[PDB]
Symmetry: D3
Subunit: 274 residues, 6 copies
């Protein structure tokens, strides 16, 4: 793995944004070669989305030839509901960039046949040529997307029932009432994300420190699904200092020593300008 | 994984039997489409076998188009010995159902060339089109079949030497005397079981609690081979309350919360019998 | 796995050499069927190499139809530098046997495009038909080759930065100065070694006991890369008594009970003399 | 230990209040025999205090002959600051009951000589004949009072610098700003609390589950100071369902099986009314 | 601690019996200086008791000036019931030796006031001048006496409710049926046994290997009460090979290396004969 | 505990020397009030001793009224042997300072009655009024003095047989011959050191990182005897960066945050000069 460590949230968000920017630009997508991006929702990636929007407005980055696939969506919640992930993505990112609406893909949590919706989502990813870069986060319980503890590490897109940690963490978005949070969600599987050519997990905050420790210091375990990426060929973990609190000093020293090498991934910072 | 938790052994046994019954009936096996079933032995699956027999006698389930593959058998033990797995399967299941003898497969622990017998077993599984549902259990050492601690997690069928825990736990079936238990056994590999389309592990009793904890709470480790299924796409763990004693409260709460959903797998319970004529609207 | 336990380093070294000898002879390589051998460097395998040379000098074993691929090499060290792995292999093994120079392959730590060199190495392995038997060791930090803690368990050949652990352990080869040990190395990946048809890890000494315990008693974890072999179909660990100090009594008892069965792998000891 | 498990926060709060009520009433304190009660602050004991007040207003319980000693107080915060523990105790408990002001003791965080203030606090506890019942809570990091991870398990009252977890958890009381939480606190030691004749730890919420697990399922460790009570002769843990999420099923079943016996501690519920 | 390792149950039993024999003889008890011996029940000590009896019958050992205190007894069971510990001791030991009935002490689980009975037991121990040597065992749950997981490590003699493990282990002694096993028992506390001048724990069988590991390889933890003796000045653990299966090789090698030194404790073997 | 972290060995050594210096000077020992100092041997404390000598030579520190008690000594090795601890202390420290020989105390590993010599050592410590400051180190196996893994945590001075780790580590002083390292040693117990008013453990180097982790991050365990100090009221751990490699980032950050506070223990630095 590549463990990138920044001092604060803003810095981690920025590093992740710069990386995505460089990857898209250097990939140089076009009409016959789109850049496929897997995406997360939540407050963690918001900073990254904000920076990406800035780069776009400044004329340094374009999403015209980018296709996106979100990792999940709540089941039974109206799409127009302000707390739906469809609403989150549109209001916080898509409506602010030059991406084609038809090239953004989010699971339909109100589909008549939920499993059919999930299977169709997998087929869309396949039809798009797979995912080039899948950006994700880690839950307090170590989950990737909604692959709660005890999820098959080779799972595909399917319906999952939210665990206690997830409900408690999202209660705020639903009047602080636990029972208000949707009981289930449609989510890409651990295997679905593992199929991406590259995976970048953004982790910020002391509240994620223990989960990060479980995911990269302890072994492959289906109780902490992000641990599955220990067997992925190209995963990058981008975090701030607080998220590293539970890791061994030796580990952080090793990767901080590698920041000179890894910062070259974002410096120089490329642009579509000229 | 799907972790199913029942109150007692009888209920856990019954749930497993109902699931197998529904899977077979809904699979609807025929001459050109057999249902392949991997099977275990021991006191644990006995309750399940008894229920399956009950279903057969009641005329609700047929094994005519089912092929079975047992996970293991002792090396050097007389096939007619009351403790051989051949005898266990014949007396506790096969002789009570309508499965065809040519469709039941058990490793021959008395073959002169043991590895050849093992390789031939894998060939039979392949010829049958793979395993649709593999039923297994877990040892006190966390083993699947006889893949003792330290076994490759991608192993195929081969000869294995029984470890201490297994010998001691099985010493009761041989005059309660240790050295009387066969030293080796022929066993499907962890990889062999992993290749099944679905795996169902039945676990009952407080004496299996620690092994279950190691297998599903701790990570993938060849010291507790059932842990390999954390990387299988479709595994079901059926246990009774006592088997969950070493698990975290949070884990049990989560899965108990899913029992209403998971009971849909055994309710309704299907039958091969003709549909009721008097059904309206 | 098969865990072979010998009394002393000498006996462990010898068992490994006998096994390699039997495997090559029984494989019976020829002009259209070479025996591909993956190899390590270091004091641990030195004893094995010395025995292999003895077998050759005695006329019992030939490397004429053997192709070798070394696990790694330091980046930046002159090829003929006395501490380079090129030099270690030439002076401690190759020049004393009948293997053809063109059939020995070692990563070029002096290449300009390091990743291109690594990719070429992988192509050479593929061209040779893969590795029949990969011999390796375990670092005090549990590494295989230079796949330091935190390396992808499905990694391929690439550049890796040495961890402090490895730097400390190899400083004795560079005038005892840490600052003089090469900072990076080219190394086959965990996945590269896993692709071998058979893997034999030689481990000796109390200083390797904790790492051995981590690799075989604890689970699959990218922090102790040799643990990856728990998912390899045919891995053999060869150790001496001191290397077993951190294992459970039960584990050692089990494998010592299998020594009669496993010694059949080296007895009879075959010879090309008939 | 006695582990008491209730369904919700309200029920756990009530059980603790009933126990304190029964202990004081049966102790039957008087002008020459006071009941010494060690007390905590925070949101956790809030429900308990509210019940105790209800009991008093109903004429069922009197604190007239009760002396209290709070486990800690922030250094530097003006005593009258709304966030001082002096303020917390006065507004949430003391001003609502019949306890004598001169019999309530809280460490003076504004003293010039901090250690002298701490030593004086210990003298006062001794002068009062020790603590009959010390009520406490557990921090997310397993602390008792402000005996942060790495505190001597036989420590006495002294100055302690708050750890990260404590700062983050208490920031909500200071406009959600971490930089506003006092850096140090005066706190009774682990040994101070261990000297109490009986110790009752109140634990509620899923956010305390891991700490409880560390304190009672893992061993005596100064990293999780509540673990020290494993060597106390009379400690009672009162929690709600959510606080038991990280414990083994076996542990919870054992203690739930003892609830019939343990409920005799609060049933019947005594009253001073005659 | 002193960890004594014998090959089989019979050998471990004999070593234990020889040690008790030498301790009594060299102590040379008299009417004004009795030898106080703490004792356990169960199948583990059976072999030891048999040897002690042989020693007595051969005229080599006398229990005339020995006082015994058993660690526990079931509550609600008829004193003369075949499964009572009163009966176990009389049948398996007392009736076969020259000890005086007035000098054998066992908790009366049928006392009107159980707690008073426990306190009285502690008084008797003190009146006898304390316990010179307390012999015990270890449960599958690591318990000493009936100090089940979660028992105070400084507990005194009291009533305890049997845990799952203990129930399942004794169910066979009551028609293999679980509910038939007495729900409670009177037991000396961990502190009670810790007060002995010397403690000898006898452990045999692979079914005790995990508990032994928890008790001496992991740290002080009230979940495995025998771990408390890590803080006792003079404890001896006597086991057979099978009981050591879960321990680290290094630990067993260290103590097997001390067997020649420790055998001096039982060789020469003394006798009261002139 | 107080964990002091310095950059390298030299800095850690100096901090320790400065602290011992300040403690002695401020203690102001005299004819009827000696400063009792417990001392260790080995390469770890060498740097500290060198600095203390400098302070003496510069006329800033006097050992005239200081009494010393060394923690251990080899059994059976001639006192005149260059590697005896008597020789180590006199050649590396005592002969270079103004301490009175009669006030230096080291166990006699060649005494006729070893236990008597040990008991006599405890009496001398008591006669001296106990130990004011006991300076020690930690073994790779976490030992304090020669209280090898599996030593009673309340042990007194006695004979101990060295464990494999100690043998392997000390072999460097006996030409690298393991079998040349003395088999046994007389050593103060864990309890003996715990009785000191203050304990300072010096830990330097990556080879000690795991033991430090075991001693302060895991719990009280007789397998890692320095862990016993978790229950000491005043222990100070002085280490360098490399010794902290196995600790959690959170722990190191907490203590580095306290370095300005703890440096007040050595700044200002006092002198006997008026
Ligand atoms: O990230 C920098 C590299 O970008 C290119 O590689 C990406 O885009 C190609 C499509 O245009 C893909 O074939 C390739 O898999 C992507 O990684 C550029 O082509 C490289 O030179 C840069 O190293
Ligand atoms: O278990 C319920 C499902 O049963 C069928 O699916 C099984 O049998 C088929 C063969 O007849 C296979 O193709 C399939 O893979 C099996 O799962 C039924 O056909 C489905 O509708 C049910 O969901
Ligand atoms: O190691 C003993 C075996 O050697 C042969 O098998 C090896 O060499 C063959 C090439 O000639 C390969 O096909 C095979 O994969 C190797 O394992 C021998 O042919 C066997 O009989 C022995 O078991
Ligand atoms: O909690 C119930 C018990 O209360 C009394 O015991 C307490 O109060 C006494 C002072 O009045 C103390 O001596 C004693 O230590 C306290 O526990 C009552 O006196 C007992 O009968 C009850 O068991
Ligand atoms: O175990 C051998 C030792 O036995 C004596 O010590 C025991 O008995 C004495 C009473 O007679 C006590 O003072 C003492 O505490 C016991 O240990 C004998 O007196 C010693 O010489 C032996 O070492
Ligand atoms: O370390 C600084 C302190 O030194 C004194 O305290 C030491 O010396 C006294 C006399 O010998 C002892 O009573 C005391 O226990 C030692 O700690 C000084 O007297 C203090 O003021 C300083 O804090
Ligand atoms: C409503 C619901 O929650 N359904 C899920 C299902 O989608 C999933 O396949 C299975 C196993 O979980 P897994 O696929 O992660 O192993 O659990 C549940 O039965
Ligand atoms: C008689 C016997 O016990 N033979 C087994 C062998 O069949 C197995 O392949 C190997 C490794 O175990 P593994 O295949 O599980 O990795 O161990 C033994 O040498
Ligand atoms: C100079 C250097 O050290 N480069 C390596 C790189 O080759 C490797 O791919 C990556 C992840 O490590 P991994 O491939 O083992 O997961 O880490 C570094 O950025
Ligand atoms: C400002 C401050 O934080 N001071 C504390 C001090 O009061 C405490 O005695 C010592 C050890 O912690 P401990 O007493 O818990 O072992 O740490 C700090 O140096
Ligand atoms: C009927 C019964 O089981 N009573 C026990 C009691 O005797 C014991 O003091 C307490 C704590 O256990 P502990 O003393 O070991 O800490 O638990 C129970 O409430
Ligand atoms: C020659 C020798 O090594 N003797 C020691 C002895 O002095 C020590 O008391 C005992 C227990 O170790 P402990 O005192 O640390 O518990 O072990 C040995 O039998
Ligand atoms: N399923 C996602 C959002 O619900 C999840 O992957 C996310 O990364 C995690 O729950 C953290 O959410 P945060 O962004 O709110 O921290
Ligand atoms: N060898 C296998 C038998 O199917 C294994 O799964 C077996 O179930 C295990 O040893 C447990 O035996 P039990 O079923 O008798 O508990
Ligand atoms: N470069 C070696 C790194 O020290 C590494 O290849 C090898 O895998 C292992 O460290 C063996 O070293 P040894 O031979 O010195 O034991
Ligand atoms: N020092 C106490 C309060 O500041 C602390 O022990 C408390 O128990 C813990 O921090 C939890 O606080 P809470 O009551 O707010 O949960
Ligand atoms: N209650 C004790 C017996 O009186 C119990 O300590 C005993 O040592 C333990 O349960 C082991 O029993 P066993 O000897 O029957 O294995
Ligand atoms: N024998 C003790 C000291 O004399 C032992 O505590 C010592 O601290 C430990 O062996 C460390 O030795 P080192 O200083 O050589 O690392």
């Amino acid at each position: 793995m590549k463990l990138i460590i920044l001092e604060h949230y803003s810095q981690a968000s920025e590093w992740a944004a710069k990386y995505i920017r460089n990857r898209i630009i250097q990939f140089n997508p076009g009409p016959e070669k789109y850049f496929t991006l897997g995406l997360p929702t939540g407050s963690t990636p918001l900073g990254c989305y904000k920076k990406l929007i800035e780069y776009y407005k400044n004329g340094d980055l374009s999403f015209k030839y980018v296709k996106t696939f979100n990792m999940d969506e709540y089941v039974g919640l109206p799409r127009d509901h302000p707390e739906s992930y469809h609403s989150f993505m549109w209001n916080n990112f898509f409506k602010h960039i030059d991406i084609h609406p038809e090239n953004t893909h989010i699971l339909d949590g109100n589909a008549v046949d939920l499993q059919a919706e999930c299977d169709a989502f997998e087929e869309k990813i396949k039809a798009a040529g797979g995912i080039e870069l899948f950006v994700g986060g880690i839950g307090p319980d170590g989950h990737i997307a909604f692959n709660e503890p005890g999820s098959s590490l080779v799972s595909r897109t399917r319906v999952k029932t939210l665990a206690m940690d997830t409900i408690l963490a999202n209660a705020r978005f639903f009047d602080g009432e636990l029972t208000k949070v949707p009981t289930m969600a449609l989510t890409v599987g651990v295997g679905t994300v593992m199929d991406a050519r590259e995976v970048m997990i953004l982790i910020t905050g002391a509240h994620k420190a223990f989960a990060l420790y479980k995911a990269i210091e302890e072994g492959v375990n289906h109780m902490w699904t992000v641990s599955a990426f220990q067997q992925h060929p190209r995963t990058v973990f981008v975090c701030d200092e607080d998220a590293t609190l539970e890791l061994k000093v030796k580990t952080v020293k090793y990767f901080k020593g590698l920041m000179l090498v890894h910062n070259k991934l974002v410096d120089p910072l490329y642009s579509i300008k000229e």
